[model samples]
Target chain A: SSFWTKVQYQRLKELNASGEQLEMGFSDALSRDRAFQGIEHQLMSQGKRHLEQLRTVKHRPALLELEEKLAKALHQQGFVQVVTPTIITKSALAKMTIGEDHPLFSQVFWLDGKKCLRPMLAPNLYTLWRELERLWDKPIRIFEIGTCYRKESQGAQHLNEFTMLNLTELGTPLEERHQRLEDMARWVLEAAGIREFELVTESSVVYGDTVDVMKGDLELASGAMGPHFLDEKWEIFDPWVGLGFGLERLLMIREGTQHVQSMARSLSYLDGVRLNIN
Target chain B: LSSFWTKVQYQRLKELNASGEQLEMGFSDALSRDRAFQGIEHQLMSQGKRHLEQLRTVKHRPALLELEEKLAKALHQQGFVQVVTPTIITKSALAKMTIGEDHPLFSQVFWLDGKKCLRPMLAPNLYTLWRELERLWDKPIRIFEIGTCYRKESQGAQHLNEFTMLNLTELGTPLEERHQRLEDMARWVLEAAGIREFELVTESSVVYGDTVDVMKGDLELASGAMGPHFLDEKWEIFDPWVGLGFGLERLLMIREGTQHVQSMARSLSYLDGVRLNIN
Candidate 1:
């Protein structure tokens, strides 16, 4: 029943003196007003936490700025029509459909009893592939920015919940996915107002499925645990590349703050939006 | 004399005091009640003139007040009191009250009042509660609240700056009470959000060494073996010190058939998944 005392302060000091994980839930009622105030401040300041802050307004103005940016991105791409969250039965998670030994199968964070929130947007992309297998005449390209949840191991790099921006395109000609990816890479950098970077074309990975178990130069991926990418290619050597960004790390590259807490509140690097300067 | 005195008290021209020294101040109850700290009430009112009238004045107001009382009840079921928290707080207190003081976002923090900032959490408020109301309740004061928190990321998929927080403090209560309280809330919230099956695991927060990851791994291993009743172990990964959370909006969004939640993020997967259900 007492407030923080010097002793409790000292205990906090102990927590600060060491690294520990913590969790809690805030209510919509109590936290709303303050959170609302914080959003208003962020938008006025153009910080990374709220996209609207980049355009200089909170609530509707900021929301619109983000929607417009997304709509434009969507208009130029060929993807799914925007319908909302689908109810996949819980049985899907425990069905053992993917593979028994597969890491995904053993994951404890699932949706409903048998279901789970989609961890990676890639699986959704695959279902899209199956649908458009008929829209075939030529090719298709798509991308999305949506929230995904994973009870990720939290430390420096993971969060129990998060947002994911995923992109996938289909075509027989290998250069298409690569080209679009390159364009997206530029789009991301430009959105963040990043002007300089080195593009290294290294490590060509080929997706190997159960059909082609003999594909990956197993010798190459021995110590590293990853998708069995060396397997199925239908007797062809189709390859892909990954341009990963620890987004927060990328921001650090731009702002020059080595400590996460130092610039986290005033994450000014989110100003790369076209809506901000243009 | 009586008639004159009565007339002079009010009917006669009154001289409004104008001296600064006419005012006197005394010690006050610095700690008070946080009306919004307990769950902000939300009510789905029926459509009508009377409903709109209540909406304008009392719909969610009383519910939240009731919810606040409920939180107090639940805690008092274990015995905790409620008190007011300062609207403006210290940044140092805020830093100590939140997740990580060294996080990248901790830098460049500011507040409107400058000296008094919005509190980022309610645990500190519990400390104040313990002091102000604990004496009366005396028996291991348990404090609980449904309140709000603020964080401005300005960049990414952070929740709205104003988000709700549910906090409970079992002051002087043993760890057993703490564990039970968290479990009770977890089950209630999940069930409220439409969850039927779940697995309860006591996860360990790695407290030491270069092998904390390994420790979490071991903790996960033990949690997975909790029981054979359901396929819980087959789906989720990692073990939390008893985590019971279900996404409210995500579940509701799916159930309600809101159209944008799926492809609203990336279009490919959401499209393929729902190609047949559309008109």
Candidate 2:
């Protein structure tokens, strides 16, 4: 006699039952059914508790809360928030060196021949930096917090669609570029309630050298100082520093959540509760 | 004025256009044109700064997000549960909605690989949830989702490639009272979003047999359907259900009197219902 049918097992998975619980063997049909009901009841109760927390305690989704907090922090530090187009032209990607052959190119959610959903905020930010240089005074500081798309292979850490927060300061003194990048990393992480993080030097595909802000094994953000090869493509020659953080990842680290999808712009989960449960 | 005052005026007009304002002027000479453009640009810049300041000080949330919160609160008060589902759906799920390769909506889908796509509508996921929630919950399972839906729409005043959809559905209603429930639900949602004047018109649908569309003047704000019909068999559903899907951006567009739907959407050019290029 089967304890859990195929459907029952799937439901348990949706309810986020542990693999150990799923693997338990039952001696009799009645016991199996009873055990299944008990597990279901327990999981449903947990989900309801989360729902109650969402309705009363948390009010706003964690991703949104982090976004608003980070935006406020950056604004206070004199970074003007700029929202850019989600759909970008192929030329923009080409400027970022994301050509047809680039590994990140295939991960792009192409809308058509000319445009695709932005894989990163850098391409658009670069465009802005160039324009702002002409329109405003030097040392133009700007940032954007918006959704970025990638055809990522599904995983606990990866999402096809995720929010990205990218902040940059252009026309910095070449000597102060490193210090500025580190200062920004601290500002953002501290605002996100992530005090323990390390800025480690790492090689990047686009930017020659990048300072990856890591929280233990996970990378929270990547910072790059410009006057690099990519700067010429956007006609930007000023010494600059930029950092990009996956907002979902920040929420994941802060909230101690496992799956990135649960913390993403999704309908399956509301404030981290799986909606399938009662 | 600089020799490139024409270029300056052109840029200013573009900014004004993005701010949802259009301007037309005639001048007898180049000197007059330059002076007129300078005055207009100065006024436009001042107006833009005031708008940006308003966004900074007052109206903290975007109109779209505000409407979502309003609608959610309204639904919650009426005993409806708010849900958040996946934006990317499977091809088989689309097929379950009877959107085969030949279906008109199939072409509009933003396919990920061969098997999945950005959801064109929230119904398929909602229906799946309906089947699951029905088994777990008591009678009258009420759930709603306000998330983005994708479609390869022709660039038009009404259509967006990416738009927010609020699909609220309730299962296990009395079969006879389905019509009245649909009407009441429409009123609750529309009025919650500050929409008072809307007309309900019955129309034929590709999936749902006959549908009621909530219209504001010429713009269709929402569509409603009742089931116990043919499509219910596909999802193994055998109950009377009433569902309505509203375009949150369309509601904001009507409420704010925005000329373009993009102004009220999760957009790059616009933030907090104010066009960004103005600054």
Candidate 3:
């Protein structure tokens, strides 16, 4: 939201039904318009001040600070962070039951028939876990924070390419899987400076049953545990629990904004601010 | 001088890697059992202690991560912003960096598709971001990203197919200060790596014609440059700027006095530069 005229027109559409735009009295609409103007000033000034801080005040973006903090929190808990290639092989997607005719099959941004941009960090984590479980002692704890690409048509809440933080614990005891998942979720949310969240059960399109970590109405993260399916493809026999979070969505939730795309890898925004707007 | 120690007949090439001591005594080399086995126990114990020390006492990260965090923190203090961009970028973006069909480095690209490739360098995206950022913010806009960059670098002790790059640029500075800022940045980065001495050697690039190479003895730890030509043509960027891209593994290799940069990267044989093949 800025002083731009269209931002108010756009913001009004966000708050009202499509055909309901003209139903209000002029006086009533003007009062609401002033409120919108107030918010626009506040948001624009906030963004202006943020860039000012990046220069004179030594301020960093909330997204970078959050990523580093969560990494440290997990690191202290003995989770090793690994950096993996962002490109994925077609067979890796096949291992996730994401081949032809799968619901997610069409969502993949293919680089070629043999290679596609990774839509999720799971396949690489799964492959690495299988090999690492043999090399390192369990429960093997590893996490990666990197970009994943998909053919997402969603708005505000999605990016064609976005950053994901995926952490998995393999060789964990079967009984501790659910509780450990919740505890780690709490740990991450707290590290992310998110004070309120709901850990609720939701079914995943990819994985059958999952734990959805929600902030207000927004699904901030989703986690799943194994022993059921998908493990067979990777030949992983160990009991495990894994969670994935959208780094930009967390910033949106944390900062009380709805336009999450501005916080991600972008050409339109610089450090969460829409570019060239005065 | 490169030298080796022999065990009976097969020479156990003496080398110190991230994992301390690695005897080039792979199974393929025919060596009698007693000779190969001798003095191996001592090496294992030393390396194992260092591994345990990292896990418990030293509390040290793999040198790559250590340098990344250190630079991030130091730059954050000095009012530079850190940004993370996509690992996969487009050919048009690569072309902006002048790595087109006729460029020497064009053949080294790892193409994901006809249009996109794993980014060979971070400049294309950073340049893309900075041009927009310059419009929104004030002068001397500094930003950096430490992430994986890919090239079909011939697998060698000095090069990796996938490596970490710390690319940073500060635009809108006065033209006279650009060279001085490059030297200052070189000092701070080298300081962060705990390197006390390095020579800034002049070098040429196929993309950007002239460059300043940060040399540790003969090893080029980093390369720095200023742009009027590179920025003006593609992005219409008309600001005086200074920038540098440092290879993180090479910094570790230079600082730790290691033989190869591989030990500092993701590898099966080494975990944080400690050889797993020891045991």
Candidate 4:
């Protein structure tokens, strides 16, 4: 009734829960108030429990813990972890074909004439691959977990500064790239505790084609292999396979949380607790 | 040591240092480049596949990141929560740390679009997160973030345009115990990084005003402070707190006794602690 107003409806909808009640002998006003109280109690209890878990258990935000666990698992499997510069050169981004006419061009958070916050980890990873291949032997597996920037459309699902995990295995055989991409994607998604995902092939601008791991309507992760479309720019001749996954999206789906911002670096939320609570 | 290596081997050792191994040793030093190379070769020859894997493992992995992760694990063990803040922060956030245009540190800022810039320091985001946590959590909320910070600087052995900063802040400690807590925290980090000796010297920062710098002779490893009013002027945070920020490269430099900052930084020419150029 009147209690399920637009404001209340929107808030409840965002929480992915409902507060509809069965008819009782109580008056309409009392029924509405009861339903409203029920919603508030649900939110308060959820917030309180999250806070208690944070205080007592000291549970890391799932997003970070997932990143750490995934990296550690890969590390044990002979994969190296690298942290590259968040601000990358324009020419570097150009190597990925994210030029002026590209869809992600406007999304680039340009720092100056020469550099901008990297929208993806692949560019720097490519730079590392070229040098690392020379120094290290073939089948070098490496991964990076860092925040990437974008001028994203404002929404619950999209963030300007989001953490990405890009893992690439370099110097696999040409034909073996396909099987290796599938195996790597499965291993990573499984390490992230994401069991229900479909590895599907999709088209990419920078990559002529990509193997994307989809979770229903959402593309949870995307994988690519070489010889890629832009290998000439980086002088990369190795047969490699890489997969990039958004940490926030992984956390969102894993924790079954409705809003992505709850697990992010935000003033409104801490350790997945919304500050909107009293 | 020179007798152990041939003339060409000695020359190759010198060449590694020149190329950027940053081994910080002369060709004659017993524990020099040639010795390390010999050890790697022997290990490869003797130990089979795992031994052969040591070359890439030792060379390709980053020393700075290893230190960062080591300190991170130490902080986590000490009940400190690790946070990851944005590399691009708002100008208002920097202003809260008193880094406006008129401020001397302002000129070094790598500005992005209007009102946004690459965070020159980690203190602003630390303050922002702390203030919010004060309202939500109990006293002594411990948090840390190790991330990249940028500043335009004169190119040298001591300066870098991009560097890693480890900012650890613990809020709501007893006001009287602030200094002791700062020292303990500093010791916690130093011990984790395998640094045995340092001097905590009182220093003045343009942005922070007053700070205790963890000095290793000429280099500053970390800067720590207790903020009651040092942060109150802008952030309105009145709680007594201790915060310490360390430059990751500088820590590695001091610990490893390297002369140049770039040797420990993210570079194409150098991987791990080894220099790539043979010529």
Candidate 5:
């Protein structure tokens, strides 16, 4: 499919799902990576788009069970899903997130006077204990693999907002428990069928409070700053590692395909891969 | 209301007077800091596109085939009636669903009643489909909606302004039955991704549970999220539901051993659009 086919499909689009196209004079927001979930156009416009959903069919048990199995295996330690929506209200908001110096306060991208996209995982999850302290037993093991958003550059590998499986535990001394993520790393490797792998701390490899597992850079064999979503943007310290698996880069190295674009998707692959979006 | 509106009006005028609006490139700006993006760009793009033109050819790749088989096979087994429906919609239908109104999930609000806005989530449309049904489904209606969703949010890992969603719903069935069906649906969807690893925590099951704690609590068993997407919505028992729909763009990032999920998603998107042409 050339740019011509792309244009044709857009032309083929009937009813123009939203008024946005007419008002903004564009199809839609041109997503770089619509990762978390995308719904088919249905309800807003008589839902003629996906009428089959209202029709009955046999429900698959195996498919749901398989999703359950995968979720359980990966929900391991150090990952937490804080179920509360991010809210900044009253004195509690001020009391909980005080000081511009605080990491939480600093990371806010204020959408308005009332709300801002959450800056870090800690604030959302940490506040849970604020309410659950009466029931706080030993360290609470939390695991979440959902979209974490922030202000950043976009392109291959980096999505403006990406899925993060940030798991942290409480009750135990924060110091010792922090190191326990190593075991989690081992669990991931074993779960994914990877056998031998090594881990290390950032202090050993560089000068910072970051969680550096590997020494130096693994890309092209040059010593580059260890990869990360955060940097010493406020002029504090160097960036830190958020999640694991430099695996895709490793695949590129082994597969000899420098363009990550090759692995886009079957539909898109058949539809034709465009320059892979960052 | 008067004061707030006045303040908003004043601010709007100020913003309007300001130069250099940084609206369109939000996605690009926010994604730069992502570790996988940094790692992959350095490793994948440095070789450049011209060097990898061979990859552009569709003749050789098999990854897409695997994904399609996974999706179609899973949908079929799940008993989903895969219906490719119409794209045209009426302005009246869009507004009734409360979609055309200003909503966060639908920040890119369009009023073709006033104009037309993209369908943000498939629910309203599914509802519309339900409303049109002359009668209830013969059995528990399990509808699988795999289509493009629109939003105002900038695109990133598990998000795109316009992207694909695998939404499964059931009509005529009880709410709990709906939960069960959705759970069943999610299982196959994830499995389809070919990442055969995870755990389940329905909102009802956990004892004041934490997802991370649950993962650690049941590390011997569970692998993914620890909490329910929703804590129990007290008003409705059925409201307390179980959901397995999530993004592995990061998990995939880890699974594929890559810095970005874009590569996997892009390939998946193509596979979704692919028409088999041994031609």
Candidate 6:
């Protein structure tokens, strides 16, 4: 006798109805099947109610709401919002030192020979800093909240298309760089309703010696200071501090969403509610 | 009199183009030119604030997303159940649709590490769902999906690397009513999209052989096909069915009269038909 069949277990997982009863065996197939049926019915009903609540009460996608909140917070801090192209030139990637031999080069969604979907916002933001440094006063603050793509193979936590919030302030006082970075990270994470996170210094492939903001085991955002190696490639000489946050990961941690795809720009989920159920 | 512009001033001018007025004779002197540039900079900052406020109050949702919801509502009212499917599909699914290594669409596919790849069209997943639903539901089942499809389409005014598609199909229709049903469904969808003028033109297709394309002026808004065809046997389907696939961006583009499809598509540079850099 089994508690649930393979099909029933899969369905329950899809419904996000798994519990300790899954390990508590049942005596007969009929009873097990009936128990699974009852659970499925309950999950479907819950999903329906949640979807209705989304239409009547929330009326906005959680990801978009988080974006607006972050944008407003940054605006209050005197950061100007800028939107750039989704498709970027190969030369831009090269400027970030992502050559053919780099580990991240293969993860890119190349549209053609010369251009591909952006894997990160740093390159574009860096390009803007080079132009804006010539145009504006010192201490230029800017940010972008947009979609970034990668052929990620990570399960549940990563997505091929996800939203990113990247903010950078160029021409900062050299001594204030670390303090400003911490403050900016705290502001963004707090605005996203994520507290109790630790800022752990970690090494990265692109931005060496990055300060990653971690909520338990998951990384929510990463910050790096400039006048480093990559700045010279983009033709920037000012001391800067930048923070990049994965908006989906932030939503996942805050809402306890099981999968990042549900929090992404997707048809499969709306306002964090899975749409497959009746 | 001759005047010179710093690199910063030229950059400001490029960003403010036509959106800011030039100072009369201000370019002739350094002090006057500085004032003019500052005025333009002030104007740009003002415009940015207004645009952000407009986003917060007026246009909260993207046009592509808005169009999707509208079309979903229209379909739901017509007894068509909406379905959401995975964005990544396996190689075997494409093979069943006759898209092989030698096929033209094969090259456009964004392949992953193994046999799986990002779905280039919604048909394979829709077709799979139809098989599962056929076993679970009664005859004459209808379903639709509005999702993103990726392709390495040529860079141009009309194409996008990632575009949204709305594919709707009704299975188990009477064989005699297939053509008429397809036409009526086409009209219903186009009307729902607020497109009043369109023509259904019979054309030859690579996969479906003969097909009916819903045309708006010269652009093809959608393509419809009636099945009992060769591909149905692969999916173990034996019903008279009709289906149509519409590029949602093209519908929005035509409706909004946008210059480029990217503006109507899922883009970072554009939101709610407003260019992000316009400020």
Instruction: Please provide, for model 6 over B173-197, each residue's C-alpha lDDT reduced to its tens digit, 9 standing for 90 to 100.
Output: 8988887888888977888888999
* Residue B116 lDDT, candidate 6, scale 0-100: 71
Pairs of colliding residues, candidate 3: B18-B273, B19-B273, B19-B274
Best by lDDT: 2
Worst 10 residues of 2 chain A by lDDT: A52-61
What are the per-residue Cα lDDT tens digits for candidate 1 across B1-279? 012212332211111111122112212222211121111111111112233234223332212222333333443343322222332346555554332356643443324333444444554454444443333333444444444444444443323343334454444434445456455644454344344444344544344211111012112111111111122222221111121222222233343333322222223332321222111
Report the lDDT of model 2 for residue A33: 80
Tell me which of candidates 2 and 6 scores higher on DockQ: 2
Using lDDT as the yardstick, the better of models 2 and 4 is: 2
Q: What is the CAPRI rating of model 2's predicted complex?
A: incorrect
Comparing candidate 5 with candidate 6, which one achieves the higher TM-score? 6
Candidate 2, residues B29-54, lDDT tens digits: the string is 78877877767766765665666555
lDDT of 5 by residue, B46-98 (tens): 33232222222322222332343367557777676543222223454455544
For residue B67, model 2's alpha carbon misses the true position, in angstroms, by 4.9
In TM-score terms, candidate 3 sits at: 0.81
DockQ of each: 0.03, 0.21, 0.33, 0.35, 0.03, 0.09
**Model 1: CA > 4 A from native:** A1-71, A77-99, A105-108, A175-177, A202-278, B1-274, B277-279
Each prediction's total of clashing residue pairs, residues at least 3 apart in sequence or on different chains, is 83, 4, 3, 0, 103, 0
Q: Candidate 4: lDDT over CA atoms?
A: 0.73
Error of 3 at B153 (Å): 4.5
- How would you encode candidate 5's per-residue C-alpha lDDT over A128-150 as one tens digit per residue? 43332333344444433333334
In order, what lDDT does every prediction score? Answer: 0.33, 0.76, 0.72, 0.73, 0.35, 0.73
State the TM-score of candidate 4 restricted to chain B: 0.77
By TM-score, highest first, what's the ranking?
A: 4, 3, 2, 6, 5, 1
Worst 10 residues of 3 chain A by lDDT: A13-22
Among the numbered candidates, top TM-score falls to: 4
- Docking quality class, candidate 5: incorrect
After aligning candidate 6 to the native by TM-score, how far in Å is the CA of A152 from where it should be? Answer: 5.9
- In candidate 3 the C-alpha lDDT for residue A190 amounts to 90
lDDT of 6 by residue, A127-155 (tens): 76776565457888878887788876567
